[PDB]
Design a protein around this ligand. Structure first.
Ligand SMILES: CC(=O)SCCNC(=O)CCNC(=O)[C@H](O)C(C)(C)COP(=O)(O)OP(=O)(O)OC[C@H]1O[C@@H](n2cnc3c(N)ncnc32)[C@H](O)[C@@H]1OP(=O)(O)O
Ligand SMILES: CC(=O)SCCNC(=O)CCNC(=O)[C@H](O)C(C)(C)COP(=O)(O)OP(=O)(O)OC[C@H]1O[C@@H](n2cnc3c(N)ncnc32)[C@H](O)[C@@H]1OP(=O)(O)O
Ligand SMILES: [Cl-]
Ligand SMILES: [Cl-]
Ligand SMILES: [Cl-]
Ligand SMILES: [Cl-]
Lengths: 173, 173
């Protein structure tokens, strides 16, 4: 059968690491300059599993073409219904609808996990990501000039968010 | 003469601790429910000092009446010119201009640390903190609904920021 969106396995972690490292080296999407090893992303993957948070891959005849996941925006208790997510498509497979397929599914999984808000931290010149999010119902709630640096230049940050329900705020426990 | 702003001493950490915990128990300024001990804030103070970051206190005839500090907004490399600060005035010493004196002084230290931007994470009902920041030239750059929860209600987040220089590009690696 053919492309699939599925939950990642531990064995996907090397493909994930390669995509992650490419984004570190070649995009303004990750505001760090540290490439990592397979075990780093394995530990990341496992921490997500422990919280029951999805790590998703897109695949075509058995090869990983992209990934998506979310985690807590911040570790403090008051943020426990807000997640910050990310989507990375292998550079050779970008512009083919995989980002929308991954994010669409991630939204479903966020609703399943009981989350209230998804937060996208997008570098302001990333028109593809801003459009991707717009098309899945996200709205711009921040525009923060010169709060990042990479490649020797200031970066601007756009926050976009999607509120997943209109429920009342939960109790303490 | 009766009142000063100064750098904090290790001996101020007990006073800082109780102001911090009061804010934990009774405000939406800290989106958590964990109170801390003196050693905890001691370590926090000492960690700020390793990075060359200020802890400041306001005092009146010897009594600590308020404190302010900043740290890295995020730990990733790309944020190394951006700090996130906080200011807390003792519950018995508010509305007397201490907030502004502390913040104004903290601004000077942020510049001395060569920072480009200060980010304030303010819960949107905190009119006092909003006014204070506006009075020192911060501008609102985010309005993010329902990203927190405390006290049975959704919390909304206002980001305000102040750009500290006009450098065209980062100037310190
Ligand atoms: C919160 C987020 O994680 S921010 C960081 C996102 N990741 C990155 O920036 C890393 C590098 N980029 C990528 O991996 C991908 O290109 C992504 C995730 C941004 C998008 O994934 P793709 O598979 O390329 O996106 P997809 O093909 O589904 O297209 C998404 C939208 O972008 C639009 N688009 C594509 N290129 C551009 C462009 N250059 N300018 C404007 N819009 C564009 C498409 O028309 C499409 O619009 P639609 O959804 O309204 O039809
Ligand atoms: C990024 C920030 O750290 S966000 C978190 C800030 N800290 C907290 O919220 C913790 C609890 N609150 C506090 O500690 C204090 O109320 C602070 C730090 C917000 C303000 O400290 P104060 O010493 O009261 O501030 P100060 O006397 O300088 O007054 C600041 C402004 O708020 C106004 N103000 C004071 N109290 C109130 C109030 N209850 N409601 C509305 N406005 C108020 C003052 O008029 C002044 O405004 P102006 O310049 O327009 O006249
Ligand atoms: Cl929008
Ligand atoms: Cl609903
Ligand atoms: Cl109390
Ligand atoms: Cl209360």
């Amino acid at each position: 059968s053919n492309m699939t969106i599925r939950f990642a396995d531990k064995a996907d972690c090397a493909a994930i690491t390669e995509i992650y490292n490419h984004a570190v080296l070649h995009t303004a999407a990750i505001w760090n300059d540290r490439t990592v090893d397979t075990d780093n992303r394995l530990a990341w993957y496992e921490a997500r599993q422990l919280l029951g948070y999805p790590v998703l891959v897109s695949e075509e005849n058995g090869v990983v073409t992209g990934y998506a996941s979310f985690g807590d925006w911040r570790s403090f208790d008051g943020f426990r219904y807000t997640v910050e997510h990310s989507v990375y498509v292998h550079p050779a497979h970008q512009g083919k609808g995989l980002g929308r397929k991954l994010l669409s599914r991630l939204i479903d999984e966020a609703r399943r996990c009981g989350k209230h808000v998804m937060v996208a931290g997008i570098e302001s010149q990333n028109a593809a990501s801003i459009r991707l999010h717009h098309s899945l119902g996200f709205t711009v709630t921040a525009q923060m000039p010169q709060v990042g640096v990479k490649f020797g230049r200031w970066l601007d940050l756009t926050f976009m968010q999607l509120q997943l329900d209109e429920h009342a705020a939960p109790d303490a426990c």
